[PDB]
Design a protein around this ligand. Structure first.
Ligand SMILES: [Zn+2]
Lengths: 615, 558, 107
């Protein structure tokens, strides 16, 4: 509270040494380095006990340092000549704040994403002399932590040193178990793409070393169990973000061996009764997340073989599984879902109360904790549990345009829905009436829906298709090789005559008397939607003779010469769509119209897309 | 006195690692198959080799083969410790694969499952596999691939009178596709477990024969005149990645470098150039189309493989339906070839594009590595990394701006990561390797270099974003898929994304904004603007004169 | 067993039970034409990971007992699996006599 204005003046002081103009990076050592006195001032104002616990004056404190190091990549590699560059001094100092913030998952994710920016997007300026002085620094500071982890076997070690050694190894393994976008090729063991690096076998070595330490020691401290849950948190984070993460389905895995490793590792963690702690969600999150990746896909056998669950059952007790109420609850839900998909269809009935399919319960209850309803405010847990219990329903599967109409007109498919004539009239009454001026965002969502529904109109007389199994367009979304304008049909149906969605599009948007001020984003949206219409339908005649540019080609005039380059290069994408028709372009007059339009831009900023628009 | 120390466990159960390895062999199962691998080998006999025997590893004539594997496993669990149990299994299963392979009459159905079993043996404990076993296994898998010489040598186009009146059978083709793909996957696995050994002992692996054998099999995989099998292209370039990555990360790097000729690299890099200039298009990945221009992942080899899950595994049911499962046989169960193929989803095409874009990221990543190996000039860091990489950068900016913006595919970001990566492959080639950028070669790509730098410096205008209100309206138009991704990550899979304290989503409404800027092709990152600025404007070479440069600056503003 | 060519598990790999169309007691599924010893070795591998020795023993005892039982009380089915399952059960009992809990012995 006292120094929020101090940091708010310090960010202005950093931005005040920009340049004479708005373009400033300064990758070279300038011949005036006074802000390194601020750099020393930044991290030294971070390791302290009083007001770092406040969220804002820590987040702005590290955001100021990231804005300093972003617009000054020379500060990293400035060679504080002990033997090395100062980014080695930055890493081990940056480790201390993260090990002091071991428990808060916000304060270490947010530190490691910007530590990712400081080496990926900032030591691409230097390469060979400065890639191998931090990818060797991480190997040495990781060799040190795995080396000092093994002199606790001989028992002469300390206890707080054991604690911070475990936590520092946790943070070093936490940095490298992010997705590939955090640390790019900045570090030479995270180098390979295709989801399989030098760090993978090294990580599977170090987690087996720390499990060997957990077997070799014996301790029942409570917060030692607290820091012992973070290794299974780290090992579920290791596998849950190497996933390809498709549209709305389960994020599919890349390497079955890493899943086998993580399941075997946390099953070994449960066998030895490691990490039991009251009202802690960590192991429950791991079990539910990893079962969510293995619901009905190719990895369900890999889940049931390597994380065996049917040997902790013990139905006869209210303490239903052995471990802890959250962990027993999550494992009971996983057991319930495995037992449900084991049994046949006739052996299970629909609840009509919790909307989950369920088998004949028990001689006891044994069905409370699976649907109790769900737990204390641990917000991801109950939605994991909803997904595990509700993925069996085999209902209308999630689809992209069905999402974006259910995100827009909420609760729309409680009706016929898949019939096509009614969604046009729902979009029509929402596109004619329910806006006064407020929807400068909702109209852009409506025009991306009008873009996608325009394709779905074109799939009849392409009489078999449907609203639900339309994922993406076969013409506007997937693309093939060769000339991309061979794919669009010359004798496709005309837009005004048959496509009622172009009637909608011209009725609201292109005949609105304030086209030259919608917004730039609504112009881009109406250009995307008009691209989809004119790629699926023949555009109208550009001129009858009475002047008369036909309110869509007029929008091409408006955006093709506009100030921003985005509307220019987006409106150049429909200039070819006007050139492809028949009974409008059979004797080549739309071509001549587009030619004498493109012969009339003697303005310097339009030179890019014009060269595109010719070609 | 000092009651602080952590107390040991008096009854430490150090787990028997050879028992765990025995169990991982016994319940090894490849993805999509009904039986386990040992349980498939219990259903296989070899009825032309009347008596196999190498070193007390007798197989009878009609006996199950997996009977003899599990007999070897039980017999050598008692005796050998783990580092000897591994190479005993490696050489015995290698000799069995060998004399099943070099035989005129015998079916080779045991060979894919023995290679997959061998891969499970190698990668179990990478510290336990001694690297002379890795050397012998590498040489065996390379000449195993040169035995199966003809799988990677089918011609591009057939006769006009190649009548397709033939029984149209797939089972033998499925077997030797599995043999080649599991063999290349095993080569990748050998080199990544060799990558995990301590960095003083790489010379126990490498000699002349390693690099000659991989040179042969690498010319075989990344083909020119034959139909490409994409499965082996992934692994064959990941091997070259592991090679460059350990040349970077060993101390006595000279012995690898003195062991490698110049002809090895200048035959490798031209095939990488020919791979980098191929097209990745969703609508005709799985099509069969014009050769050597579209990375296409043929229908007739669509299964996972031993490391990475590469297709949708459409041929995984046929691995299980390759045997009768209630019978002990040698010939395969008949798989009809034209029954597969039956239309539901082009999402499969999107994720196969995702793999192929990661493949091109891999190729220009090993370009980035061997810039750093050969920092001094050589035959190979020779200026054609301006030509091929600037052709690549210019075309993947061009058809990004013309085709992909607003096409709601997941693969846009990675496709505009490639350009954002290959600029740096330009940039450190520009700043740190100008001594070999020959003047005649720069003018071969003076169009494309200058235009590709211009499409980064056009973003310094930035009259598009400038706020927050219309940028999220733009990301409804271009980047709704990543909103679905980040909501599924936030509600299920990320520990930091619950109880968001109004500093962790104000980073999200910075980085989704810079993401959708970098996708929308206006407002890239400022650092890449600087890297593109300090190539064109810098006076290391006169790309433009001072009256030709401001003709480019007037086409932004300026 | 002394005098036999194959091992006992390797004899049970050569045995199927074609009148009991689906055997199952507690995740110990045997199919109709499947090898029986396939299911024994699947049970063994599955219960090595999970159970410690005194529970691994009586799990094997009651599962192989239920299999011997419903092969035995059947009118049409041959009983060839039963001697080797009883010999296998004897090998299970006498391996570590301190580990076999005596309620398993009673049953
Ligand atoms: Zn469309």
């Amino acid at each position: 509270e006292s120094h929020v204005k101090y940091l708010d003046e310090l960010i202005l002081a950093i931005k005040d040494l920009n340049s004479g103009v708005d373009s400033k990076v300064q990758i070279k050592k300038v011949p005036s380095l006074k802000i390194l006195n601020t750099l020393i001032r930044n991290l030294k104002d971070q390791r302290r006990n009083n007001i770092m616990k406040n969220d804002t004056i820590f987040s702005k404190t590290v955001s100021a340092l990231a804005l300093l190091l972003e617009y000054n990549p020379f500060l990293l590699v400035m060679k504080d000549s002990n033997g090395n560059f100062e980014i080695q001094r930055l890493i081990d100092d940056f480790l201390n704040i993260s090990v002091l913030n071991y428990d808060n998952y916000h304060r270490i994710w947010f530190m490691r994403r910007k530590l990712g920016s400081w080496c990926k997007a900032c030591v691409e300026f230097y390469g060979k002399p400065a890639k191998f002085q931090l990818t060797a620094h991480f190997e040495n500071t990781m060799n040190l932590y795995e080396q000092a982890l093994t002199e606790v076997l001989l028992g002469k070690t300390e206890l707080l040193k054991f604690y911070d050694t475990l936590k520092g190894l946790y943070i070093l393994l936490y940095w490298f178990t992010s997705e590939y976008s955090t640390f790019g090729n900045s570090i030479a063991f995270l180098d390979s793409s295709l989801g399989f690096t030098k760090f993978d076998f090294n990580f599977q070595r170090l987690i087996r070393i720390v499990l060997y330490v957990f077997d070799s020691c014996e301790l029942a401290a409570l917060e030692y169990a607290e820091i012992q849950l973070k290794y299974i948190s780290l090992v579920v984070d290791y596998v849950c973000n190497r996933t390809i993460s498709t549209a709305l389905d389960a994020p599919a895995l890349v390497c079955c061996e890493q899943l086998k490793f993580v399941l075997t590792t946390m099953h070994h963690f449960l066998d030895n009764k490691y990490g039991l702690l009251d009202n802690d969600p960590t192991m429950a999150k791991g079990i539910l997340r990893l079962y969510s990746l293995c619901i009905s896909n190719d990895f369900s056998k890999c889940f049931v073989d390597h994380f065996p669950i049917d040997q902790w059952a013990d139905f006869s007790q209210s303490e239903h599984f052995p471990f802890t109420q959250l962990t027993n609850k999550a494992l009971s839900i996983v057991y319930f879902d495995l037992k449900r998909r084991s049994l046949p269809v006739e052996a299970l009935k629909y609840d009509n109360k919790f909307n989950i399919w369920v088998y004949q319960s028990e001689p006891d209850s044994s069905l409370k904790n699976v649907t109790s309803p769900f737990d204390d405010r641990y917000k991801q847990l109950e939605k994991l549990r909803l997904l595990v219990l509700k993925k069996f329903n085999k209902t209308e599967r999630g689809t992209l345009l069905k999402y974006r109409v259910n995100q827009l007109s909420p609760g729309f498919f409680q009706r016929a829905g898949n019939d096509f004539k009614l969604i046009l009239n729902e979009a029509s009454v929402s596109i004619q009436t329910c806006f006064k001026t407020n929807n400068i965002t909702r109209l852009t969502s409506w025009t991306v829906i009008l873009g996608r529904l325009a394709c779905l109109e074109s799939e009849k007389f392409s009489s078999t298709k449907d609203m639900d199994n339309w994922y993406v367009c076969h013409l506007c979304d997937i693309e093939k090789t060769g000339n991309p304008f061979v794919r669009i049909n010359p004798n496709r149906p005309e837009a005004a005559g048959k496509s009622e969605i172009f009637r909608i599009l011209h009725s609201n948007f292109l005949s609105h008397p304030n086209i030259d001020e919608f917004s730039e984003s609504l112009l881009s949206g109406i250009l995307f939607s008009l691209h989809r219409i004119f790629s699926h339908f023949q555009p109208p005649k550009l001129t009858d003779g009475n002047g008369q540019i036909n309110k869509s080609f007029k929008l091409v005039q408006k955006c093709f010469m506009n100030s921003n380059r985005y509307l220019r290069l987006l409106s150049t994408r429909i200039i070819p769509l006007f050139n492809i028709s028949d009974s409008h372009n059979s004797e080549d007059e739309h071509t001549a119209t587009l030619i004498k339009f493109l012969q009339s831009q003697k303005l310097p900023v339009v030179k890019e897309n014009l060269v595109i628009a010719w070609t | 006195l000092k009651k602080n120390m952590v107390p040991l466990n008096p009854n430490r159960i150090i787990p028997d690692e050879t028992s765990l390895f025995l169990e991982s062999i016994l319940l090894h199962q490849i993805i999509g198959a009904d039986l386990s691998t040992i349980e498939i080998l219990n259903r296989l006999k070899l009825d032309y080799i009347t008596e196999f025997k190498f070193k007390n590893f007798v197989i009878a004539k009609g006996a199950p083969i997996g009977k003899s594997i599990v007999s070897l496993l039980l017999r050598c669990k008692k005796t050998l410790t783990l580092d000897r149990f591994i190479d005993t299994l490696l050489e015995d299963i290698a000799v069995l694969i060998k004399e099943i392979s070099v035989h005129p009459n015998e079916s080779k159905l045991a060979v894919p499952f023995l290679v997959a079993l061998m891969y499970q043996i190698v990668q179990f404990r990478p510290s336990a596999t001694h690297n002379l076993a890795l050397k012998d296994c590498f040489l065996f898998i390379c000449d195993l691939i040169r035995i199966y010489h003809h799988v990677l040598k089918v011609p591009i186009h057939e006769s006009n009178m190649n009548l397709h009146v033939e029984p149209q059978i797939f089972q033998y083709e499925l077997i030797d596709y599995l043999i080649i793909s599991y063999s290349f996957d095993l080569l990748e696995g050998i080199l990544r477990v060799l990558q995990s050994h301590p960095k003083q002992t790489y010379m126990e692996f490498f000699d002349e024969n390693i690099l000659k054998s991989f040179e042969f099999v690498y010319k075989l995989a990344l083909t020119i005149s034959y139909k490409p099998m994409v499965n082996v292209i992934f692994s064959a370039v990941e091997v070259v990645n592991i090679i460059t990555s350990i040349i970077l990360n060993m101390d006595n790097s000279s012995d690898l470098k003195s062991l490698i000729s110049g002809s090895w690299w200048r035959d490798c890099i031209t095939r990488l150039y020919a791979l980098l200039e191929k097209e990745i298009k969703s609508g005709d990945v799985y099509n069969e189309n014009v050769d050597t221009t579209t990375l296409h992942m043929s229908k007739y080899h669509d299964f996972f493989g031993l490391i990475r899950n590469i297709g949708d595994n459409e041929l995984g049911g046929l691995i299980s339906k390759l045997i009768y499962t209630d019978r002990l046989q040698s010939v395969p169960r008949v798989i009809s070839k034209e029954d597969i193929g039956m239309f539901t989803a082009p999402i499969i095409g999107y994720k196969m594009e995702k793999w192929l874009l990661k493949l091109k990221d891999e190729v220009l990543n090993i370009f980035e590595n061997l810039l750093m190996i050969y920092g001094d000039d050589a035959t190979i860091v020779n200026g054609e990394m301006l030509i091929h990489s600037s052709k690549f950068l210019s075309r993947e900016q061009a058809l990004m701006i013309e085709r992909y913006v607003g096409q709601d595919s997941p693969n846009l970001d990675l496709r505009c990561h490639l350009i954002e990566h290959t600029l740096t492959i330009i940039y450190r080639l520009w700043k740190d390797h100008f001594k070999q950028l020959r003047e005649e070669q720069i003018k071969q790509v003076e169009s494309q270099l200058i235009m590709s730098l211009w499409r980064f410096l056009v973003c310094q205008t930035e009259t598009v974003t400038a706020n927050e209100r219309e940028m999220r309206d733009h990301r409804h138009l271009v980047d709704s898929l990543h909103d679905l991704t980040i909501k599924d990550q936030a509600s299920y899979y990320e520990d930091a994304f619950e109880d968001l304290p109004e500093y962790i989503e104000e980073e999200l409404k910075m980085q989704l904004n810079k993401r959708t800027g970098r996708i929308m092709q206006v407002k890239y990152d400022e650092k890449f603007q600087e890297m593109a600025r300090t190539i064109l404007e810098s006076k290391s070479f006169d790309l433009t004169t001072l009256e030709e440069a401001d003709s480019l600056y007037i086409s932004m503003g300026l």
